[PDB]
Amino acid sequence: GLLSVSGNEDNQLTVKATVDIGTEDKPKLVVGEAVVSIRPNNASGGAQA
Amino acid sequence: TFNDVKTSLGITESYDIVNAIRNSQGDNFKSYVPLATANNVAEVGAGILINQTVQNDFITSLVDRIGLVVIRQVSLNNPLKKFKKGQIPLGRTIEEIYTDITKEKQYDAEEAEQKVFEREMPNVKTLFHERNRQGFYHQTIQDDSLKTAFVSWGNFESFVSSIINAIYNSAEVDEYEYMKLLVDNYYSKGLFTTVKIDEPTSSTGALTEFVKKMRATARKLTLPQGSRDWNSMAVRTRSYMEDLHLIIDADLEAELDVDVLAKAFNMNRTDFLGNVTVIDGFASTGLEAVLVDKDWFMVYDNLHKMETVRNPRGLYWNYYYHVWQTLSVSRFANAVAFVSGDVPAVTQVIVSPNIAAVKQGGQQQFTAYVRATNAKDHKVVWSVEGGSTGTAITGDGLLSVSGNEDNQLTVKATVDIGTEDKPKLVVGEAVVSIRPNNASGGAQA
Amino acid sequence: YTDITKEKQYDAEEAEQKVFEREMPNVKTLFHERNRQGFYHQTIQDDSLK
Amino acid sequence: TFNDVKTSLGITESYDIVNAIRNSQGDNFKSYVPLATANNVAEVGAGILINQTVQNDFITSLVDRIGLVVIRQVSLNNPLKKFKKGQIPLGRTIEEI
Amino acid sequence: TFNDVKTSLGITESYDIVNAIRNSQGDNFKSYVPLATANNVAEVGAGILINQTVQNDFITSLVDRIGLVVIRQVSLNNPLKKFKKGQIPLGRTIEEIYTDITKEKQYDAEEAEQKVFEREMPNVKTLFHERNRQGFYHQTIQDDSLKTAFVSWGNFESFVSSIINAIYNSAEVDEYEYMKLLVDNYYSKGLFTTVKIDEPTSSTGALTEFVKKMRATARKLTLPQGSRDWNSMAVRTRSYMEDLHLIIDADLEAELDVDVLAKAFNMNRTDFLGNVTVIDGFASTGLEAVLVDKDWFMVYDNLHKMETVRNPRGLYWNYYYHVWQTLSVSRFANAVAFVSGDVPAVTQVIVSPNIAAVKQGGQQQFTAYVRATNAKDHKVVWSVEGGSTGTAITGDGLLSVSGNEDNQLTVKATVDIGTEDKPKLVVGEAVVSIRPNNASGGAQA
Amino acid sequence: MVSFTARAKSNVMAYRLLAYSQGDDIIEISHAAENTIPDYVAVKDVDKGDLTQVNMYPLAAWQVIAGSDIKVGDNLTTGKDGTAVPTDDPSTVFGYAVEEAQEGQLVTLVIS
Amino acid sequence: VSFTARAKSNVMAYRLLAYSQGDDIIEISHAAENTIPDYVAVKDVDKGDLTQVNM
Amino acid sequence: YPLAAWQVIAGSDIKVGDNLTTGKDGTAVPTDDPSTVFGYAVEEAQEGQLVTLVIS
Known part of the structure; x- marks a missing residue:
């Protein structure tokens, strides 16, 4: 559940918490949903280490 | 700051009631x-x-506003x-400090000729507790x-105060947890x-027997004359019925409320199993219920204050609700555990002069x-441990110190349970300070 | 609806640098709107x- | 007048709750x-x-004191x-008569 | 807690008085x-x-409690x-700033004929002092x-107050030490x-000779006509007995009292001249006494603030006693040292107008x-450094400056102590800024 | 940390394992090839012609996209698209999982 | 950072350790002879005792 | 303090991405023979200038 946003994400994100119940032949996905507003910052970045 | 939010956000419908209603035909809905x-x-x-901004009907350009803000001042008390x-x-x-009773002596006035000034030490025992909690919010x-x-x-300030109240709530929540910790400790x-009980969930009968055990116990703990049992100091104590507090693990309460037709079904007060409190599980196994005196808890407040600080760079305040407490258990008080399933034949041996x-x-x-x-007879093996001189203790607990013992002694009361292939030694322990005296000695007779 | 805050251990040494530490409160909201409008x-x- | 007392004196633990807590994983404890x-x-x-004398934090040389004495006035009536x-x-x- | 602490924790028992008494016969014990x-x-x-826990003499369960706390307040002074x-x-x-005397010239109108407006510079010397201490408690x-x-x-407040007082004591101690630092520096x-002496702390002759030298020196320091010999600026000056302060120590004091003043009929003929004080000794090896003018010290206060701040999280106060001050010494003031240890033939060469x-x-x-x-002639060698050539000193301190310099110059005077394989050099220095000379030329004959 | 400038040369995606090469007076970066040991991890999308930076620091662990299901303690190597996948060939191991991850989820890793 | 380890068999302080896996949680034991160890014990850890690895 | 990158005086001219080894006086110089490689430069540097590159 730790969300990590890229250094250049420009769009609204949806976070889902899916629990698969039933069987693999007809999976049932119970989904919790949340939304994330992205905040600009002009932080430096690219690659690390 | 969102540009696309569905009203179904996070909602897994089992059915669409709107659809269900319009598709109904004189039946459900x-x-x-x-x-x-x-x-x-x-x-x-x-x-x-x-809150997706909604436009006003009649004039689309007007915006429907928030007509009410509700600050949910909800408390969470311990x-x-x-x-x-x-x-x-x-x-x-x-x-x-807990003093205790003195043995009756027969009024023999002839013996009284010489026994005036006879020394009789009082049965005084002690127990210490210390500040051990120290955290903050x-x-x-x-x-x-x-x-x-x-x-x-009004709303602004109400909101701020609810944050502060939330701090207070969290303090209460944690106290609750620490008190449970003390029980489990x-x-x-x-x-x-x-008390060995049979897991109530396995049978209505077991469940019923459990209640009888609690009831019997509850009575025993409140017998005015006292009984030594029920406390780890083995001191004679009583309890008043209103001092009893039965702690229920979980759903067990409900299970008894309904299954025990002959007890719980017609009660809701002190008179029946003492006062009843309910928690959200002991999470320690065995324990399904705990019965203790109101004086069993040594909870003292040592520090309660909120410090504050204003950041000038960032416009905010930090609050530091400091909570220091003495959290402990008053051995001396009556305390019974209702432990289901397998238990030790002997839980603990108590040596009286600690x-x-x-x-x-x-x-x-x-x-x-x-x-x-197991309510069966057990044998106590008395032994001295440590020390200098090989001095010992009789087979009935009478300690006898040598005329030259120079070291601290340990007195043990061991009860061997189980079998000879894997003996289990339940040991009561006590310590002895040795007092010098320069008494004469060597050998006798 | 505000909510509880996690207890922190009173370590006065850590407190040397953690003054002004930010701790956002667990605040959640819920909205309701006039939705009935009929007459008799x-x-x-x-x-x-x- | 003792020089060696354990906090476990006379205590037969069935389990060590400290150990149990740190070894828990979203389950009991x-x-x-x-x-x-x-x-x-x-x-x-x-x-x-x-009461093993305990030293004060911050200044080790200071001694924590007994802040409260509780006299247990408990009766045992007939x-x-x-x-x-x-x-x-x-x-x-x-x-x- | 420290568990098994012994009463002998910091004891280096020399003969065990318990046994000394125990087995004493005709012996005084x-x-x-x-x-x-x-x-x-x-x-x-x-x-x-x-503090080890002690149980009550009668009731082993009870703990004896401390019925008296003493806050030992102490004050230290510089x-x-x-x-x-x-x-x-x-x-x-x-x-x-100090204006020195000049030098007598011989009257002779034959020279005066031409030298009417020639300028003669005043012998002015100048020192500067800077803030040195900016530390804080x-x-x-x-x-x-x-x-x-x-x-x-009462005890709580007394204790805390004491700590704050200890801060001020800290300052007094260090200020004292800093002034000593100026002396040893x-x-x-x-x-x-x-001034060479011989260990007052020895024979009565050593003491006596010291006293003689002290009184004699004091006389010299106050002679009406002044002297250059007591200064690091080597300027002609004078001080009074009211300015003179003898620093010394307790050891000397006792020696004087017991072997001298106690016998003297006319105490004023052997006691020390000027004001006299006592310190805890000097750190510099061989330094026994210091005699200076009251203006030798150049100590000034720059800041004495005690800031206080609360840590709301850690629950504490931080006291910041900022002590800023100028710590220096006047080289114009008279200052001598009485040294018992071995010293250099020349301890310092003072050079020119600076x-x-x-x-x-x-x-x-x-x-x-x-x-x-050590009273020897000591030939003085002169040198000029920093420039190219055509600039030099004759050997009598007379510097001739070339037709073009550049670099800032330094002149040196020195004395060779020891041997050619141990050429210790005492070196005095002076700096010379070169003023541009606009005279033209380039190639000449 | 020690930062330096590097240019993507092939649509760098966040949380992917990265490799690098010597380019036109600049270090160029891209997703690490399958079955090897990566040098850097992306934490921002950087397109094929985009110029960015790299923050140097001996990180204890990386958070990368799982290329397949991963069990706690599994030794990991590069997979398709620079994702991390379970392996057993030491020479391609660059770290190991300390937590479970399903394909497409982030998996924390400890470098070796 | 850190993570939970389940030990494996009587870890002693200052000894070189190596990781493995079993039921789930990473198992820690003394590193085998003639190889490269993964971690250094800071304290003694009992056979099946959970603890932390301070990365 | 395990550094991932160093700043070393260049013993010659170094291009970005060049593998580096020890040179005269312990300076960093370009190489091509794995064994001598201790690090790769991340920036161009002229002889006498510091060059910063990752270890590896």
């Missing part, structure tokens, strides 16, 4: 069919998570708060920024006078109380 | 009733 | 895991039999007390 | 035999480093404080933890005029004052 605005109610019946014993501003250690309140969310100062140490001081060449009778669960 | 039309034939 | 000072509470939760019929200062024999 | 509790007094009365020169709120540099007060150590507000730089600013193609006269502690 029939009475909703005439509800002129049911569709609206159905759409936002659960409210919405994100269900065990009633056991707080007050506070201690200065110092750290608490010394409990850090909380930032981003002042000034919040002023854009509220229109009225005391339990893990085998210091409860345990702290003894015996002279070189002097003696000290010790008494062992074997807290057995 | 009723004729009373006055005078005739007399 | 889960709610104790966040308790910032649980270890202290677990150590002296039952109190101690012998449950049958209500049947006392009074007293007889003089004489010895009672004649019921 | 026999006087303690009649005592009933001598063993307990002998065992503990020396003091207890670590004896040298009286030499402080006051306070300077603003600015920083302290300038000390830092003290944390952990109030709420202290509250567990004290059970009375100035000494380490060879700036005291050295700050010079000779114009390109010019000429200037430098000089030297050799502090010949």
Whole structure:
């Protein structure tokens, strides 16, 4: 559940918490949903280490 | 700051009631069919998570506004708060002192000729407790920024206070947890006078028997004459019925409320199993219920204050609710554990003189109380341990110190349970300070 | 609806640097809106009733 | 006047709750895991039999003191007390008629 | 807690008085035999480093409690404080200006004929002093933890107050030490005029000779006509007995009192002249006494603030006693040192007018004052460094400056101590700024 | 940390394992090839012609996209698209999982 | 950072350790002879005792 | 303090991406023979200038 946003994400994100119940032949996905507003910052970045 | 939010956000519908209503035909949902605005109610019946700005009907350019802000001033009090014993501003250690009864002597006035000034030491025991909790509740309140969310100062201030109240709530929640910790602690140490019960969930009969055991116990703990049992200090004590507090693990309460037709079904007060409190599980196994005196809790407040600080760079305040407490268990008080399933034959042996001081060449009778669960006879093996001189203890607990013992002695009361291939030694322990005297000696007779 | 805050251990040494540490409160919200709007039309034939 | 007293003096633990808590994983004892000072509470939760002098934090040379003494004024009344019929200062024999 | 602490924790027992008494026969310790509790007094009365728990004599369960807390308030003082020169709120540099005497010339109108307007510079010397100390005292007060150590507000408050007082004591101690530092510093730089003595702390002759030299020196320091020999600026000056202060120590004081003043009929003929004080000794090896003018010290206050701040999270106060001050020494003031240890033949050479600013193609006269502690001639060697060539000193301090310089110049004067394989050099220096000479030429004949 | 400038040369995606090469007076970066040991991890999307930076620091663990299901303690190597996948060939191991991850989820890793 | 380890068999302080896996949680034991160890014990850890690895 | 990158005086001219080894006086110089490689430069540097590159 730790969300990590890229250094250049420009769009609204949806976070889902899916629990698969039933069987693999007809999976049932119970989904919790949340939304994330992205905040600009002009932080430096690219690659690390 | 969102541009696309669905009203179904996070909602897994089992069915669409709007669809169900319009597709009904004199059956289920029939009475909703005439509800002129049911569709609206159905759409936002659960409210919405994100307030998507809605335009006003009649004039689309006007915006519907927030007509009401509800500050939910909800408290979360510690269900065990009633056991707080007050506070201690200065110092750290608490010394409990419990005196006890004295044996009756026969009124023989002839013996009284010489026995005036006879010494009779009182049965005084002690127990110490110390401040052991010390935490705090850090909380930032981003002042000034919040002023854009509220229109009225009344709402603004109400909100801020609810944050502070939330801090207080968290303190209460944690106290609750620490008090449960004390129960499980005391339990893990085998210091409860345990009672072996059969897991109620396995049978209504077992469940019923459990209640009888609790009831019998509850009575025993309140017998005016006292009984030594029920406490790990083996001191004679009683309890008043209103002092009893039965702690229920979980659903067990309900299970008894309904399954035990002959007890729980016609009660809700002190008279029946004492006072009853309910928790959300002991989570320590065995324990399904705990019965203790109101004086069993040594909860004292040592520090309660909120410090604050204003950041000037960032417009916010930090709050530091500091909570220091003495959290402990008053051994001396009555305390019973209702432990289901497999238990030890003997939970714990109690040596009565926990702290003894015996002279070189002097003696000290010790008494062992074997807290057995199987109600069978057990044998106590008395032994001296440590020390200098090989001095020992009789087979009945009479300690005899040599005329030249120079070291601290340990007195043990061992009860061997299990079998000879894997003996289990339940041991009661006591210590003896040796008192010098320069008494003459060597050999006798 | 505000909510509880996690207890932190009173370590005064850590406190040397952690003053002004930010701790956002667990605040959640929920919105409700006027959704019913109907009326009860009723004729009373006055005078005739007399 | 002792020079070596264990906090476990006379205590046969069925399990070590401190160990149990740190070795828990979202199961039993889960709610104790966040308790910032649980270890202290677990150590002296039952109190101690012998007051081993404890030094003050911040200044080791200072000694923590006893801030409270509790005198347990507990009575043990005769449950049958209500049947006392009074007293007889003089004489010895009672004649019921 | 420290568990098994012994009463002997910091004891280096020399003969065990308990046994000395125990087995005493005709020996003087026999006087303690009649005592009933001598063993307990002998065992503990020396003091207890670590408080170990003691149970009550009668009830082993009860713990004996402390019925008296003593806050030992102490105040320390800087004896040298009286030499402080006051306070300077603003600015920083302290300038000390001194006009020296001149040199007699011989009357002769044949020369005067031409030299009517020729200029003759005043012999002015200048010193500057800078702020040196800017340190501060830092003290944390952990109030709420202290509250567990004290059970009375009287003791609590007394204790905390004491700590703050200790901060001020800290300052007094260090100020004292800093002024001593100035003495050992100035000494380490060879700036005291050295007087050779022989360990007052020895024979009465050593003491006596010391006294003689002291009184004699004091006389010299106050002679009406003045002298250059007591200064690091080597300027002609004079001081009074009211200015003179003898620093020394307690050892000397006692020696004087007992072997001299006690016998003297006319005490004023052997006591020390001028004002006399006592310090705890000097750190510099061989330095026995220092005799200086009251204006030798150049100590000024720059800042004395105590800031206080609360840590709301850690629950404590931080006290910041900022002590800023100027710590320096006047080299114009008279200053001598009485040294018992072995010293250099020359401890310091003072050179010229110091700050010079000779114009390109010019000429200037430098000089030297050799502090010949061991009374030898000491030839002075001169040198010029920094420039190319055509610039040099004749050997008599007369500097001839070339037709073009550049670099800032330094002139040197030196004395060789030891042997050619151990050529220790005492070197005096002076700097010369070169004023541009606009005279033209380039190639000549 | 020690930062330096590097240019993507092939649509760098966040949380992917990265490799690098010597380019036109600049270090160029891209997703690490399958079955090897990566040098850097992306934490921002950087397109084929985009110029960015690299923050140097001996990180204890990386958070990368799982290329397949991963069990706690599994030794990991590069997979398709620079994702991390379970392996057993030491020479391609660059770290190991300390937590469970399903394909497409982030998996924390400890470098070796 | 850190993570939970389940030990494996009587870890001693200052000894070189190596990781493995079993039921779930990473198992820690003394590193085998003649190889490269993964971690250094800071304290003694019992056979099946959970603890932390301070990365 | 395990550094991932160093700043070393260039013993010659170094281009970005060049593998580096020890040179005269312990300076960093370009190489091509794995074994001598201790690090790769991340920036161009002229002789006498510091060059910063990752270890590896």
